[PDB]
Amino acid sequence: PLTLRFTCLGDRNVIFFGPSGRQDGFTPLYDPSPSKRVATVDAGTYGLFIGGVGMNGEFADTIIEEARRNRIPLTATELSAESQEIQERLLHDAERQPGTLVEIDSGRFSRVFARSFAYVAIVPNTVWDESETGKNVGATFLHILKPEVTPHGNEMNDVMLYTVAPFGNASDSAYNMAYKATMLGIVGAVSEYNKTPWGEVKPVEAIRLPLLGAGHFRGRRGLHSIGRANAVAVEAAITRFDPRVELQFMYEPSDTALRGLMESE
Numbered sequence: 447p448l449t450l451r452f453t454c455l456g457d458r459n460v461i462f463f464g465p466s467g468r469q470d471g472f473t474p475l476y477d478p479s480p481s482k483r484v485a486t487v488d489a490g491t492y493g494l495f496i497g498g499v500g501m502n503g504e505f506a507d508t509i510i511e512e513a514r515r516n517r518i519p520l521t522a523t524e525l526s527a528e529s530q531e532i533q534e535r536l537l538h539d540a541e542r543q544p545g546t547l548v549e550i551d552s553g554r555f556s557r558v559f560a561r562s563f564a565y566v567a568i569v570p571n572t573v574w575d576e577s578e579t580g581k582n583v584g585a586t587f588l589h590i591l592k593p594e595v596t597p598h599g600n601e602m603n604d605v606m607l608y609t610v611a612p613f614g615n616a617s618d619s620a621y622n623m624a625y626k627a628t629m630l631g632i633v634g635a636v637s638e639y640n641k642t643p644w645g646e647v648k649p650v651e652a653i654r655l656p657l658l659g660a661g662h663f664r665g666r667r668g669l670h671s672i673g674r675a676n677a678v679a680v681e682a683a684i685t686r687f688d689p690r691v692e693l694q695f696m697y698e699p700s701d702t703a704l705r706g707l708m709e710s711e
């Protein structure tokens with residue numbers, strides 16, 4: 447865990463994982479024995495469902511394995527549908543009221559989610575043209591996981607986030623604006639959540655971020671430009687909310703989450 451204090455983030459300690467004992471080197475979504483409640487961010491898709499491949503595929507696999515371990519019938523198709531319907535409705539309310547943490551008690555009708563939230567810092571398809579970025583970009587959700595689907599059966603791994611990153615082929619104008627909107631949403635949701643009663647009890651105290659839009663949403667875009675877009679976004683979000691939480695950046699071979707912020711440094 448490479449810890450570096452960043453002056454442009456107002457003297458905040460940011461973590462940067464190196465490679466791991468994997469063929470891919472990816473950081474694990476959640477730790478086996480964490481000291482903090484770490485909410486990992488799902489690199490979501492336009493369909494707003496949990497599944498598919500990449501990092502979105504990991505979340506599904508992890509949730510389902512833990513579900514089957516606790517002898518809860520949960521298939522990939524059920525998780526995809528149940529998560530899409532929820533995040534579809536929460537998106538509707540979030541867009542009705544930008545900059546406000548909407549909510550539904552998913553626990554009443556869910557084997558997976560105890561409680562689900564959403565937050566939209568900027569209405570999709572206003573500041574940018576979604577024809578360039580894809581739809582529902584910037585949207586962000588926060589789910590509290592029921593104990594039976596909680597990674598490694600650990601009470602602290604009971605929070606996740608889900609966001610949709612801009613497609614790389616978007617204009618630098620549209621891309622950077624979508625990326626900051628995306629980051630404001632993540633930090634905003636956690637900020638606003640920690641102010642809720644559930645936040646007092648189960649406060650998020652760190653955020654595990656992948657390099658958003660650096661996988662299948664990269665297209666023809668260069669990883670440097672993404673490191674910039676990410677660096678600028680974090681600066682604004684930190685300046686916006688002045689958050690107490692700790693940012694953690696997962697590992698990918700190019701290490702551009704760090705290089706970009708070093709440029710911002």
Ligand SMILES: Nc1ncnc2c1ncn2[C@@H]1O[C@H](COP(=O)(O)OP(=O)(O)OC[C@H]2O[C@@H](O)[C@H](O)[C@@H]2O)[C@@H](O)[C@H]1O
Nearest residue numbers: 472489491498499500501502656657659660661662663698
């Ligand atoms: N299993 C994985 N675990 C951890 N990190 C991963 C994994 N696979 C890729 N990554 C890395 O996480 C970041 C995001 O990965 P992706 O989700 O593949 O890229 P993204 O453009 O954000 O998402 C595109 C597509 O992939 C699905 O996750 C999702 O359904 C979306 O449609 C990238 O930096 C990538 O290196």
